[PDB]
């Protein structure tokens, strides 16, 4: 016990969610380490995570150096988690060795889910079952479309801009964008946000005229913006597009359970 708790040659891990944070039921554990691991299975067994009330979970990796934890099940509300890195010089494999021990204990807020339906073009925002938002949106074009699944809340912006260059698709081409936005709320680490789009309010609700990006009202952003947190679910349903790949970023519950709990430790 010469420990570390998580705030929000070796390898030093970093775990998410970050002490003492209060996250949305779809927020899964998250370790990442500054090295790429060749013994998964090792890593794995050096991490102890419990969970009151207890419910089964499992690991999948992104990655190689980033493994992520989590329930069949989105969490239920209430739920406390405790994450244990016990990772001090432990054999990692290759001539690797964890650097040290890590700790987080965390707890489980309301239940937060926002449909977005691309066959009524409103996204509604439901807390613990019930409806309490109703947003029209417009969302990826048909030749941009956005991708259908289970988008998990990551970070959040009071402004910020988005560069289609970060994505490997240049500024200057056809759907380039270097554009400006206020209450930016990320869902995808592809780039998928629900954001202020005053351009797009005439489309909200009729027709698709974003990049993939789910475009709302001023006000319907900055109210997403306040109520949203790390772990609440976006859903997109019925788009033309794809699915989410599960290994995104914010994708994981977009792989089944049976495909994730075998895990691929190799």
């Not at 936005?181 to 780039?191: E, L």
Request: aromatic share 10%.
């Amino acid at each position: 016990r010469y420990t570390l708790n998580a705030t929000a040659h070796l390898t030093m891990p970093y775990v998410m969610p970050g002490d003492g944070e209060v996250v949305g039921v779809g927020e899964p554990v998250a370790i990442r380490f500054d090295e790429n691991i060749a013994d998964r299975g090792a890593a794995e067994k050096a991490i102890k995570i419990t969970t009151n009330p207890p419910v089964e979970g499992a690991f999948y990796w992104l990655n190689n150096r980033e493994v992520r934890w989590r329930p069949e099940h989105f969490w239920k509300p209430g739920t406390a988690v405790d994450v244990a890195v016990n990772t001090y010089g432990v054999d990692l494999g290759e001539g690797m060795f964890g650097e040290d021990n890590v700790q987080t204990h965390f707890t489980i807020g309301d239940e937060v889910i926002a449909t977005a339906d691309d066959n009524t073009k409103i996204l509604t925002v439901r807390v613990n079952g019930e409806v309490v938002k109703s947003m029209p949106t417009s969302m990826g074009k048909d030749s941009t479309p956005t991708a259908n699944g289970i988008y998990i809340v990551g970070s959040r912006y009071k402004h910020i801009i988005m560069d289609s260059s970060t994505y490997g698709v240049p500024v200057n081409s056809p759907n380039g964008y270097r554009t400006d936005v206020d209450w930016a709320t990320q869902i995808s680490y592809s780039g998928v946000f629900v954001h202020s789009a005053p351009w797009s309010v005439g489309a909200q609700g009729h027709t698709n005229t974003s990049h993939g990006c789910l475009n709302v009202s001023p006000s319907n952003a900055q109210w997403f913006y306040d109520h949203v947190k790390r772990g609440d679910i976006v859903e997109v349903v019925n788009t033309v597009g794809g699915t989410l790949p599960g290994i995104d970023g914010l994708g994981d519950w977009n792989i089944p359970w049976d495909q994730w709990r075998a895990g691929n430790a190799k």
